[PDB]
Amino acid sequence: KYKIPKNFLSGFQILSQLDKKEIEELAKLLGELPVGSNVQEFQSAIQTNKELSENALKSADTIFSLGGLLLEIKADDSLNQVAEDLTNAYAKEGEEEIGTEQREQLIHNLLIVLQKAENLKKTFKAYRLLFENTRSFRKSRVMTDMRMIFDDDQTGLIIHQLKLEYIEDNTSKEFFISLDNDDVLKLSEELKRSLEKEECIKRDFDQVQFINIK
Amino acid sequence: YKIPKNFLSGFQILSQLDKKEIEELAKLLGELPVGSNVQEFQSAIQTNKELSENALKSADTIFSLGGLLLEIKADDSLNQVAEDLTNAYAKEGEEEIGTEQREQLIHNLLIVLQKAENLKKTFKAYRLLFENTRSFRKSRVMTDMRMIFDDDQTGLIIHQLKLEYIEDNTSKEFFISLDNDDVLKLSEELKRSLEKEECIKRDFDQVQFINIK
Amino acid sequence: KYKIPKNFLSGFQILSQLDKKEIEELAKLLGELPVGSNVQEFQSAIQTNKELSENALKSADTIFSLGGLLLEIKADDSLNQVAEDLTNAYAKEGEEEIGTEQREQLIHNLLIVLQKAENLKKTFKAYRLLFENTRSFRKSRVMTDMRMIFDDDQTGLIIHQLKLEYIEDNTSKEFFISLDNDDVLKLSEELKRSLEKEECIKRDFDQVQFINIK
Amino acid sequence: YKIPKNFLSGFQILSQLDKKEIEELAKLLGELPVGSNVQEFQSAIQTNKELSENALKSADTIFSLGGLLLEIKADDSLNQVAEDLTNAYAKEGEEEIGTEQREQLIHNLLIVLQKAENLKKTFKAYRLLFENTRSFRKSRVMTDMRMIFDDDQTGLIIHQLKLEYIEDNTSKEFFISLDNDDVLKLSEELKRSLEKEECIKRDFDQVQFINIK
Amino acid sequence: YKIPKNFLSGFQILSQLDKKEIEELAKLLGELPVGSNVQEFQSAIQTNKELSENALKSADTIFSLGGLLLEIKADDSLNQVAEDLTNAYAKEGEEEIGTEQREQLIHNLLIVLQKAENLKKTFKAYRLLFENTRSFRKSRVMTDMRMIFDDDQTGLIIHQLKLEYIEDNTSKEFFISLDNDDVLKLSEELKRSLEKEECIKRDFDQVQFINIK
Amino acid sequence: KYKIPKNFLSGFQILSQLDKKEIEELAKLLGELPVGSNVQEFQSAIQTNKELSENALKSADTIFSLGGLLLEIKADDSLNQVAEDLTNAYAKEGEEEIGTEQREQLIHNLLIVLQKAENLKKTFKAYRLLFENTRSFRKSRVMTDMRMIFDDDQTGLIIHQLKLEYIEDNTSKEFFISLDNDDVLKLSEELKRSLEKEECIKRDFDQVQFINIK
Amino acid sequence: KYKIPKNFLSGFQILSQLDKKEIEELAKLLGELPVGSNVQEFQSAIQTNKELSENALKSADTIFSLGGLLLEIKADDSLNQVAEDLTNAYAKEGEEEIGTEQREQLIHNLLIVLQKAENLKKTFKAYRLLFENTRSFRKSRVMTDMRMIFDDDQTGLIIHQLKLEYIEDNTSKEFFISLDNDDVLKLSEELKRSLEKEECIKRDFDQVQFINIK
Amino acid sequence: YKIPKNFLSGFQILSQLDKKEIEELAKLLGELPVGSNVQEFQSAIQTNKELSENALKSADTIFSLGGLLLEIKADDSLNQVAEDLTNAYAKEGEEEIGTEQREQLIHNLLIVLQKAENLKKTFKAYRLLFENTRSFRKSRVMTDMRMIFDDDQTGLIIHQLKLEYIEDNTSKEFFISLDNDDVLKLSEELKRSLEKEECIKRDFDQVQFINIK
């Protein structure tokens, strides 16, 4: 069924072994992790909690990666089956064979974590819904070029070549467009107006948690 | 050569001006600085009390001659341009032009065309500024909400930037989706680009960098 | 400044002439007209109000058309200047010359209407913001084709060729895509789910007036 | 000819079957109805208690032969196909194949290929169903809110329909914006298209219209 | 409703026909087989010696009603269509229509529209045949020579196939380069496609497969 | 400088070793090979020449592959440098070290072949110039579909969906277009007319060798 | 059948009236006009022939315009039918009615000209076949821009933005591409090499008349 | 940070250089003028008889550091870059690095990075020269013949210009058809563009305009 990215096998090894106290603090902190939090500030929360070890800290990527799976889980998919399917996949890529005690404790630890992966599921939902668009912005760059006006017996233009890099059809693409100084000003004003509108939409609808991924 | 019927009244008017008024029009067109629009040329005539309302009404037609001066064949005298324009007006006059008016028109267009040097530079700049694969026209941002539905409230604010541009002489739309951080980073790049323009102006201080108006 | 579509000159003629009572009822009804109402149900509201005549009814297109202008009107554009600029444009396309009394009454009547064009301005804003997208849907059609599977010594496919007609870059365009029976079912389910989500978004946010243009 | 290393175990297994098991595999593959997926072929072997787990493990490899049967040169005997496959397996066996196994493999593939007639029809249908300029894969709708900001609350609900399709062997996205009425009218057309399919099935009742699985 | 000024003479003419002529027009339009063009409808009127030249001159206008019958709202009587057309003609008559002619036109259009059933099917086929992403219009092949220049005579013959098509209601060109073998293989596929059409006609023998004309 | 496709190292091994008689027959046959001949009919010519062995036959791909290099060779690129650059590259991918006698004989044999690779260079030139187009045809397929005309109380269309597969921008692409029966006939006539024009262009210009690659 | 561009009705008026001597010289000169000659050098040939009048000179556009029709004329289309169909169309756009004598003389004069329109038919064939391409060049322009390299405590690039204007799908389009100085040099060399190849193709195949339209 | 296995030998080599050799490498890299390619850097090391073959073998790896210097976070010391590179090498050393070599590598990379200022400018120019919507790579012209077939010899010579370019990080082809006059006019514009470049160099004489190599 599942196949585990080879670099996460280290984190499942750790996860089969976390102490029943430590796994509960680690799952507790995961549930406390607010929606939109990236893995590095989940790591930072682990690294500072004096109840969580360096081993828990090293498991953060594996735990956080389950959010990509959690979006598939139906209303009647049981988390026990998920914890076992991940446990059987983990064992199948050993050259050792995983002892039954380690197997049981891993199923339990993953299940305990999956029970608390609620805001993590919302974080992967937010991340995919943010990029469900025809053209998702990634970066911009502006070249500020000079175009000299040649004469028939000292005059010139400055052209702002805006590059937008975007994803469309899962493909990295670039759009170039030519702006004068006044175009750059009026586009800056529309961008400012859209930020002003974002702050208005947050003060209204103040009962919605609006999410930033970065 | 043909004259658009939009401007026939202006060649008529311009054929009717005094040597004093037309000499003042040409000198004023010569002082008009490169990058000046027709509104500033009209404004400058209006404030000169030795140019009439007929001179002011000619100003839009005169400013159009900046374009033709880009198209002329390089061996042509401006006198052949003035004659060709005058016949192209007379051809549109179903009432036949007076011989006095034909002389005055060739004279008046040619005296103007002699000072059209900055008008030519102004139209070169207009051409060269839009000699680009995609030319910006307008921008608009739709600040949309996308709610995150749980299976059993949380949401995204998505900035849908619309860029309107000309390409292949065609008017087109580019939509792209930005979050708050993307909007700041795009704004930060635009500022940095405006700073770069001011640097290229502070260096290269002997080049006049012109803004279209 | 302005130029008036030749067929609306009839409606300005009527509008210069509505009775001070009738113009106030007509502007009152305009302000009562809810956002998203099209001109034909503004006409229908006029046609039924026993205080508004057949002449008011014939003016409805001209009044309703001002909403396209009202989106340009700045915070310090005065409605008097709008009413006069429309009045000077109206007179300039007469072959008669408009008498001063008719001019004054038209400025007043248009201004009285423009003061009540609030939900009409929102209706034109809604209409433009609804079509501010890369591809605005206009129509769909499905061809239900048969593709026979030929054999080497009675079997076939049914292919649902969905056509979407859309506007992009102000251009009328068509997109064809090929669906099997199961694709048509799963797309129908996503469309149903999106309608369910629209009804949820209306019950939440029940303090927002959500607008349909048709 | 080459065998993908994904299926080498299946030719090995299939070379190891009894004449009884392989005769039952071929007959069962012959009864498998057109449009059956490999899951149904596997399921049908599993429930036949005279086919082994080795037979069940061969089923994915056998079902792949439906594709090759579309590519074969029309004068070829299925016996030349079986030999070419057997050499293409032996070429991948760095441990050299037994002569008994070479006979059994050519025999076992050929007995199967003799009954692959509905498997060929099933793969024709798969090809012909995706022989289209744009083939549907998935749909998703984002129900977004677009607030109408007054200069001094009102909003639009916009259904952003995403269609995912294959074109030019490439995976692509088409986004289109719908209002509530557009979504109903599109749904109404889909229903009408499903009704048309049932009519084409009720008429033309002697054609088997197959669904891919 | 509006009438194009191209056809006003035809509604005029058609308003002027006898109950005998108009009954013969409708019956003849009813016998006209699906897929018949206006040339065949004109030809069939011409050879019927009880239809006049005025009937023949009406034929192009009548054939245009096949299109409108695709656009009508399904609850409408054909009598409301005939009235709406008659007012749309009277609206274009700056000389006002006689009341007798208004009755005769509603009568004459409605008697025709009653037999337009195969004309409707003919226009459905026209629509459905061009309800495609790219519709063929024309082909042309340029047989070009490309010489192989040695550094110190040999050449390629390249068949530049041009396909002209409609897409997005726009007229477009597709050029593709073929060698001699590609041209034969493309020709071989077209023949095989024509054979497949004749098979689908020999089977399904109770379906009328219509050609546009 | 060069790097040798690992499967051609076998053919260079053979080529370092062909007998001075056999290499001259093999190069002689290569020069006799007419422009447009593919490797399999070069192989077939080797396989039948009673002076060329099975070893020569196994070298045909390596010899024929030099035509892709021969298009780069300038007016003052010496074939000795080519034969050595290929010989030094061959040795560099051994785990053995190639003996000097084998090195000298390979340089000589390759040089003798390269001196006779004239029509082979024209064959690679022909092959590249044939595909120097915006859209190079690879294959066509026609689906012969039925489109039924539904009615409001037994009529249908047959639509020939022609697929052309082509290369553009080094990318495999497909173009679908819809034809009726008469379109298929008129396109067939234009294709026939273009074949007739090819035969005319060959009878005129009968002093040009016109090349087919397949 | 035909409809005549309103400005060519003047030339048919002249053509109905040319003298039997003059029409034969005018058709004789047309047959002498070499393939690729434009109308202005047909006019120039008329203007200098002392047997052709100013009236013949004014007819040159109408005569030359028949080449666009002549490409449609089949192997069994008779020129008499063409001359009459053009004559009946000419008369139908008079407000006068054309006298029978004028009608007969026009049919004869056009037919006499059409009999000599051979190189004119080749000139319209050449003109259409020259533009039977995916992208027909119309104009180029290069902007020579400066791109300054900014620094972190006097260096720059010159970028040659080549614009090609072309027709594709009957649409006026532009392609911009960015070149450095060396790209401009190497493209110039390929263009020179293609001109050298054109001169070679003319010296070989010296029995073909190679045509330039401009 | 990761090192590509293509360059691991170069960090190894570079970790093994003397303070004398590495000081000469850095100074020489500092004198290398902006726009110099790695071939000229290699050539300049080779001719300096106080740099070894190991120094010459390091040159390709050093020249690659111009790229990383565009990506560094602006607050970073070059010392943190050198450490990060050294750990990224040690991470790829399955045989563990000596502590002496770790010091020498951080030292040797940092002494080089101190003089990489013109290497940074050289890589900026490379980036900025290809920061364009379509970047030229190659051109080719096919001089084709198109014979004019009479119904009962004459021909066109058509110059098929192919431009190869990068767009969207993708390699693409633009074909356009030119006649002899179009080819001359395009050549005339290119010359005029080269003249304009020399003018922009003769004016603006205090700017170094660099050519990529």
Numbering used by the authors:
A (entry chain A), C (entry chain A), F (entry chain A), G (entry chain A): 22 to 174, 180 to 240
B (entry chain B), D (entry chain B), E (entry chain B), H (entry chain B): 23 to 174, 180 to 240
Show sentences the authors wrote.
The ten eukaryotic COMMD proteins are core components of the Commander complex, with central roles in endosomal membrane trafficking and signalling. We find that while CCDC22, CCDC93, DENND10, VPS26C and VPS35L are restricted to the eukaryotic lineage, ancestral COMMD proteins are present in both Bacteria and Archaea. These prokaryotic COMMD-like proteins have very low sequence identity (<20%) to any eukaryotic COMMD family members but share a conserved and highly similar fold including both HN and COMM domains. Our biophysical studies, crystal and cryo-EM structures confirm COMMD-like proteins readily form homooligomeric rings composed of eight or ten subunits assembled from core dimeric building blocks and inter-dimer interactions that are analogous to the heterodecameric core structure of the eukaryotic Commander complex.
